[PDB]
Structure 1
Amino acid sequence: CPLMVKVLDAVRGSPAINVAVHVFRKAADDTWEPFASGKTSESGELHGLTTEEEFVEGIYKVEIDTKSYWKALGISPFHEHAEVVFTANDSGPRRYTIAALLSPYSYSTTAVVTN
């Protein structure tokens, strides 16, 4: 499991369920190419985005579609989406978990990098 995304809802105190997540990898010409995507589960998690073979070193962007999430709950949001941009490095630990905690006008994101 090279890359996992976990999302929490700070207003309801719950996993953020059915949130669209898009992962991109930066191409040689500096454009962002679609890499993987999915929707978070009932546990707020998104598994199976990629494989060890495909997840090579490079610069990745994870876009979490927070605006649509809040709108589906009838709550007025600030951001278009939450964005997490990072370099994958083979030097460090092998599993990346991108965690996000969502409020209508604020979010935090943390990388948990483990073996």
Structure 2
Amino acid sequence: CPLMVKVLDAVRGSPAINVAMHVFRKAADDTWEPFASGKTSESGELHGLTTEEEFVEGIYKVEIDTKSYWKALGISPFHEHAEVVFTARYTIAALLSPYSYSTTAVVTN
């Protein structure tokens, strides 16, 4: 698992479950090509987005649909979504509040 995303809910103190996200890879013409996607599990984790062979050097974007998540809970959010854009084992963690988010990368051997 070369890429995993973990999402947490700072309002309810829980994993953020059923959070949808898409992963994009930047193409030569500088547009974003869909690469992978999924929803966080009950543990707020999304695994198996890609494989080692497939996960080559490049600029990747993770677009997390935080807006739909807050809407399903009945809470008005500030952001349309949360993006994480980086040059590429990776774990991306995102901590969500209605008017704030934080994201960190844990890059290991």
Instruction: Tell me if both proteins adopt one fold, taking TM over 0.5 as the criterion.
Output: yes
In structure 1, distance between residues paired with 2:13 and 2:48: 25
Consecutive aligned runs of 4 or more in structure 1 exceeding 4 Å deviation: none
In structure 1, distance between residues paired with 2:76 and 2:32: 29
Q: Deviations over 1:6-32 (max 9, x none)?
A: 000000000000000110000000000
In structure 1, distance between residues paired with 2:104 and 2:71: 24
Output the aligned Cα RMSD.
Answer: 0.3
Matches within 5 A, 1:20-59: 20-59=20-59
* Cα distance, 1:87 vs structure 2: 0.2
Partner of 2:104: 110
Partner of 1:87: 87
Aligned length: 109
Sequence identity percentage: 99
TM-score by length of 2: 0.99
Q: Which runs of 5+ in 1 are unaligned?
A: 89-94
Q: Deviations over 1:27-52 (max 9, x none)?
A: 00000000000000000000000000
TM-score by length of 1: 0.94
